[PDB]
Amino acid sequence: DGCYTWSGTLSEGSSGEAVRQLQIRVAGYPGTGAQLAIDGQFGPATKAAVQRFQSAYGLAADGIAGPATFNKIYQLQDDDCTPVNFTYAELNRCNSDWSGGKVSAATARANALVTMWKLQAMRHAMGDKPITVNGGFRSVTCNSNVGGASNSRHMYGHAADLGAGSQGFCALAQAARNHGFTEILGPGYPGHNDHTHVAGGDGRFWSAPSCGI
Ligand SMILES: [Zn+2]
Numbered sequence: 326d327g328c329y330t331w332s333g334t335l336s337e338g339s340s341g342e343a344v345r346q347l348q349i350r351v352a353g354y355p356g357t358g359a360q361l362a363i364d365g366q367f368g369p370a371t372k373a374a375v376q377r378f379q380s381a382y383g384l385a386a387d388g389i390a391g392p393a394t395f396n397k398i399y400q401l402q403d404d405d406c407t408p409v410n411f412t413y414a415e416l417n418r419c420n421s422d423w424s425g426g427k428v429s430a431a432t433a434r435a436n437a438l439v440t441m442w443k444l445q446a447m448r449h450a451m452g453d454k455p456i457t458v459n460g461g462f463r464s465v466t467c468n469s470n471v472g473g474a475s476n477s478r479h480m481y482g483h484a485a486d487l488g489a490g491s492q493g494f495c496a497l498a499q500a501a502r503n504h505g506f507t508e509i510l511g512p513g514y515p516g517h518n519d520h521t522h523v524a525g526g527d528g529r530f531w532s533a534p535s536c537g538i
Pocket of ligand 1: 479484485486521522523
């Protein structure tokens with residue numbers, strides 16, 4: 326028993342860290358073209374996300390976070406709080422301290438953590454096949470070494486660059502639309518034919534012309 330343990334049921338009207346932690350876990354279920362706010366307040370958007378999560382794993386979908394809902398999260402949660410199929414190291418091929426960015430190392434890792442939970446949801450929705458992560462966090466040095474953009478969300482811990490795997494670039498960019506990625510760049514967008522870029526953060530910008538987006 327390590328990362329986090331929920332003490333009791335959560336429903337609309339609840340507020341606190343327990344709510345903030347659950348929002349992270351279900352951040353991959355905000356509805357198409359939406360983003361869940363991680364504010365610690367259990368409102369209607371939070372109930373909807375929970376319902377979607379419950380449905381995705383064949384639990385009773387009532388939108389109430391009870392003990393069965395927590396037992397499923399416990400099955401997807403690693404010691405360090407990351408989901409079972411993604412790790413911090415896989416999300417940072419830059420350095421080992423998450424320093425260098427446009428925000429704190431702790432803010433960078435927390436932003437990363439949400440991205441991991443969104444990827445976990447997407448991994449299951451796509452059929453439980455491995456999703457290849459090619460890059461994630463980039464300090465300012467790392468970003469320049471790549472010739473990245475000055476504004477790049479990579480330096481915030483919000484983005485991940487995905488390789489084709491058995492899904493293909495387009496399948497990944499299309500599904501990303503359902504999992505809280507406000508920024509998606511892929512095939513047909515300049516410098517994005519050899520990977521699919523997904524990122525969280527404010528402001529929606531979707532472009533992958535070769536994929537129909
Ligand atoms: Zn990228």
